[PDB]
Amino acid sequence: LSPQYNWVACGILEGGLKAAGVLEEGQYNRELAEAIAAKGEGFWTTQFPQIGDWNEDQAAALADRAQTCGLVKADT
Numbered sequence: 856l857s858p859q860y861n862w863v864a865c866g867i868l869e870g871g872l873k874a875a876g877v878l879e880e881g882q883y884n885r886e887l888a889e890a891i892a893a894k895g896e897g898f899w900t901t902q903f904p905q906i907g908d909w910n911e912d913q914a915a916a917l918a919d920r921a922q923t924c925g926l927v928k929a930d931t
């Protein structure tokens with residue numbers, strides 16, 4: 856069992872995503888990923904496709920970690 860998914864790690868993740876304004880109630884994985892990506896947009900994502908892509912990919916990965924932590928619903 857990796858400490859990376861214990862309630863302390865998951866609770867830090869959950870607090871941080873709430874404080875960042877991206878996590879909410881009854882949210883699906885996809886919705887969280889989209890919300891993270893929207894907040895990650897800025898000068899660099901606009902100017903360079905590779906950075907836009909990095910933003911989306913990391914948002915997706917973070918939303919996946921949130922789902923593992925039981926913070927969002929799976930996609931159906």
Ligand SMILES: C[As](C)(=O)[O-]
Nearest residue numbers: 876877878879890
């Ligand atoms: C930016 As949101 C997921 O709180 O509508």
Ligand SMILES: C[As](C)(=O)[O-]
Nearest residue numbers: 876877878879880
């Ligand atoms: C508080 As809302 C409109 O992002 O669900």
Ligand SMILES: C[As](C)(=O)[O-]
Nearest residue numbers: 869879880881926
């Ligand atoms: C009940 As809640 C706002 O921690 O998803």
Ligand SMILES: C[As](C)(=O)[O-]
Nearest residue numbers: 869880925926927
């Ligand atoms: C599993 As919950 C109440 O932190 O969305």
Ligand SMILES: [Zn+2]
Nearest residue numbers: 876877878879
């Ligand atoms: Zn909101």
Ligand SMILES: [Zn+2]
Nearest residue numbers: 876877879890
């Ligand atoms: Zn909102």
Ligand SMILES: [Zn+2]
Nearest residue numbers: 878879880890
């Ligand atoms: Zn919302």
Ligand SMILES: [Zn+2]
Nearest residue numbers: 879880881926
């Ligand atoms: Zn809840």
Ligand SMILES: [Zn+2]
Nearest residue numbers: 908909911912
């Ligand atoms: Zn990609």
Ligand SMILES: [Zn+2]
Nearest residue numbers: 908909911912
């Ligand atoms: Zn990529």
Ligand SMILES: [Zn+2]
Nearest residue numbers: 869870925926
């Ligand atoms: Zn919660």
